[model samples]
Target: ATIGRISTGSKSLDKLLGGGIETQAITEVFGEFGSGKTQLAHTLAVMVQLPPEEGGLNGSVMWIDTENTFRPERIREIAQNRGLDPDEVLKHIAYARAFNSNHQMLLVQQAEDMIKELLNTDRPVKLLIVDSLTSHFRSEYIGALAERQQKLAKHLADLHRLANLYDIAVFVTNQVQANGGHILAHSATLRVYLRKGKGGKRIARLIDGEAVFSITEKGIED
Candidate 1:
């Protein structure tokens, strides 16, 4: 079986990802502020709840909000507009606020336990999201580069385990910095680089040396 695929949520973008976000793999998306990274994440929160045939997990979404970016209201609007039951859609998602890097790692590590005790008793978690992973690391461990990398590595390894152990999909949003050839960038299964295009549009390109996709208000498309 295929290990994972890219999930654009949008059909066109899914095609670009070679047909949907991969299961059991880490897909990293990076961009500057206002580049629609959060927007795509919001869309995924709703999209991943759709049936698998529609290129979704049709399961619950675990949103790890490190920077207070998990907006349920926005997700509700998108769900309602998409003809899904807003309340039910919202109910399927689990949210946690990460006050700092340590808190973030703890929350991620405890997600499995939380799911068993709090979320669906039958259906397992199908998706995991970390919105702006770089924010907490950059802020918490400033001037401590080695420490930051070590912490991040541990966190990511846990996420990888979650995906494989649970047969779920993992998506992480990252903040861009000057190209540093760092280990973090090299660790992701898929690395997408996003930027502002002509007329303030958002263009997402693959950074393992490939052109990826273009972002729009509707969703990410090729």
Candidate 2:
């Protein structure tokens, strides 16, 4: 059992991440729509709950759903497929639907408060997921580029601070944006690129070359 690494729910994905992702750092996943980013997010939310020997952190997950992408039924499906109790698995995840950018940041503040409470429990929350991190920001601030950048910096900094302070894994999903993508890339410990491949498959490139995955009823897998 490792202290600070959790699998990406696939053996090949784990190897690409050099064993597994560090629990104390930010890992970014970016891709176009239908490219399996959200599928991976759903997969991780369940995988992070398993025992460490099974490549999990033995912890809980909290999702910040910025794009209304979180689906409880999907979580239940993944949990059931893993032979875990679907109801119990659902309980392990805390969720919020952020209406806009300000709401999103405010939810992060709420998450901070919630984390403090979770620490006293047997299964503490250890994963923070922001699904489609930039959707609200991108849609709301088209004219004020500088302002958008400032807000992005502050919001991302907040996430980094929470990750460091809690010693938990921060996994964020993103849409493809050309500029300032480098800033996000530079900040994250790992970068994952995903795109459509053969049939129902999506190809992901991390530090390693492409690995093919598909979204099934169970969730993301090789």
Candidate 3:
């Protein structure tokens, strides 16, 4: 079967991505705060449920929230604006709060089980989101580069396996340090660097190109 692509709710960004977020691989979006990284994740949580004809995967999402960025109200607002049943859209997303790095890894494993449990359903899981993937590791493993990278590498490896094994899109938001490492950079199948532009817009830069989009009440838009 062909890989599925889930819309980011921004048409221009979707075009830049060659359709939308690709399943069966990891897509990492890195940026500083207010760069709309988490906002993009929130939009995907709702958009992933839309019918395939509308650029969604027509499947459910599993979200691991490490930075307390998963907000139901935000989902509701986006769904309502898109003419979807807000409650229905919100319910399809399985949101889990990851208190620490270990909890984060645990949630990913749990998500695998849940995906298998729903394998035969109409809403089989198609998207997995880890908002601010590096926060916990950054704090818990401070000054221990080797230990942190080892654990982070393992965590990312698990995420990579989940994407391939389950055929789901792994969307992770990362903290972009002035100096970053190769472990995260090399693990991602597709990497986008987001930065704020003028007038509340965001610029998403890929390896070779960039696109500008804005976040509105309805979610990301052209």
Candidate 4:
């Protein structure tokens, strides 16, 4: 089987990732507030829609916003700043807001259907992004670690299966707590850790590695 990668629109991040984020696998970015996790997600949302020659799939983005933070204006700004037509870019993107844990999970099933439905359409969905993946599970399973772990584990497994089944990339933002981070890091093909740096700066280093990089207005840099 051939492994594939999608550029993250940041050369430094691409180098750190050994090219780009691998497709058909899950890539989870775990960080706390002010760490630039959501920024990365928003950037990729634009990058994934660019032409293949431009390091994208020339496809559509599927966004699951559980934190109620899907910013259309932010995405439009990024797309326009990149010189792509914001209207066209927004047209290819699909957005969904999940109000609760069950709603979030059900969105996944709806996503499965949407993916199949897009097969015959232009700009097929190629990226799956769940911003703050663990917040819902964590709150719902309070005081029950075992139940939380079991449910969360199965949830990730379903996504893993779908990514491979559809040959799409799964990129999710995660909470940094042990209950959420532990299983996500274990299940994901890549677990990127982000933290704040000195003076309005941010840092991201892959877990179990020392290839640390900093966040910038343009994306990521060494």
Candidate 5:
């Protein structure tokens, strides 16, 4: 089975990804603030609800908000605009807020249990989103370089396990720093670098990146 798929929500982007996001793997998306990372995330939350015939999961999305960036209101508006029921779409999406690094880790470990609970009542999540995966850990352990690396490695491991065990698509957003090295250039299944282009437009470029996507006013169309 394929693993680590990228969901573009936009056909053009999906096509660029060699069809669509991998079925059971963790895919990382990173960009500076205001570069459309969160917007793309919200778009996927809706896209995964599309029918399988459209190369989607037709399932629910679980959003783990670290920076309080999960906005259901915007998503509802987008869903309604797309001719899908706002309530139904919202019902399929689950939201959780992470307070700290340890809290986030606990949430990751408890995902299976949470899914089982949801399934008992007939709600099974198919996608997982970690918006800004490195924030709290970075802030909490800033200046403690060794500890930060260790924590990041552990959290990534948990995320990997969650994706494999649940057989769900994992999408995580990461923050970028000017750490010059091949490590930054090498890590992540997909490492996209975003910057302000001419005319103040956001330009997304690939960095050993796997797939690319862009957000528009019409709601995640390529």
Candidate 6:
């Protein structure tokens, strides 16, 4: 069955993503610091609030804000640039700060419950995002590689199920991992590697393609 998708707000990037990040899938975005990972997430948080004709889902977002990156003012900036009510766009996003990896996992379950509760509502949650999904798992499970791997797998499974069951798009930001990166790579439906480019532009490289985009006050652009 076909489901709706959320745009990245850049023409080339959206084309590389086969229209956009579709529902019922995990689009793992990873890169180094200052590579515009969080910037893309923030842009999506606003884009998801737009109507489908403009490449949105007309739905709400549930953001598990790890790494202290959830910014309403940034959302306001993007929304205003897109001619949307900044306040209303902000209202549609349900933000939760996840303190650690375990907390992050728990929040996904909470989001699942909430999605079920709002299943039939006018603006049911359509996106679930975990900004930097690997930080806590990396720091907290420093030496326990086996344990950390197991838990991370479980966490991702929960996220995958929620995306499928609720028909929601799952967007997760991940840090560069020297080891154990395969754990995330295998689970991701579509993995996009981001890197800083010359002239203040950013490069988003998919396994099968590439796109150039820039992050400004208005969000992702060509």
| Candidate 4: C-alpha lDDT | 0.78
lDDT of 5 by residue, 1-222 (tens): 345343566665576556655556666766666767788788778777766665566677788899998888888877876667879999888788999989988888777777666643433567888887888877898679788888788887777676766667788887764772222234355555555445444455556533333455445664
Off by over 4 Å in 6: 177-180
Global lDDT scores for all candidate models = 0.73, 0.81, 0.88, 0.78, 0.69, 0.88
Name model 5 segments beyond 4 Å from true: 1-6, 118-123, 177-187, 196-203, 209-214
* Descending-TM-score candidate ranking: 3, 6, 2, 4, 1, 5
- Weakest ten-residue segment in model 5 by summed lDDT: 180-189
Give all candidate RMSDs, comma-separated.
2.8, 2.3, 1.3, 2.3, 3.0, 1.5
| lDDT per residue as tens, model 6, 60-89 | 999998789888999999999988999999
- lDDT, ranked from best to worst: 3, 6, 2, 4, 1, 5
TM-score of each: 0.87, 0.92, 0.96, 0.90, 0.84, 0.96
Model 4 C-alpha RMSD vs. true structure (Å) is: 2.3
Q: State, as a TM-score between 0 and 1, how close model 3 is to the true structure.
A: 0.96
Model 2 lDDT per residue over 113-170, tens place: 8888887687887899999788888889988878887887888888888888887889
Report the C-alpha lDDT of model 3 over 91-164, residue by residue, as the tens digit. Answer: 88998999899999888889989999987899999999999789899889988988988988999999999899
lDDT of 4 at 118: 85
Model 1 alpha-carbon drift over 4 Å, by segment: 1-7, 115-122, 177-183, 209-222
lDDT tens digits, residues 60-120, model 1?
8788988887777888777776557889888888888888889889988889886565335
Worst 10 residues of 6 by lDDT: 176-185
| Clashes, model 2 | 0
Residue runs of model 2 more than 4 Å from their true location after superposition: 1-3, 177-185
In terms of TM-score, which candidate is stronger, 3 or 4?
A: 3
Better candidate number, 2 or 3, judged by TM-score: 3
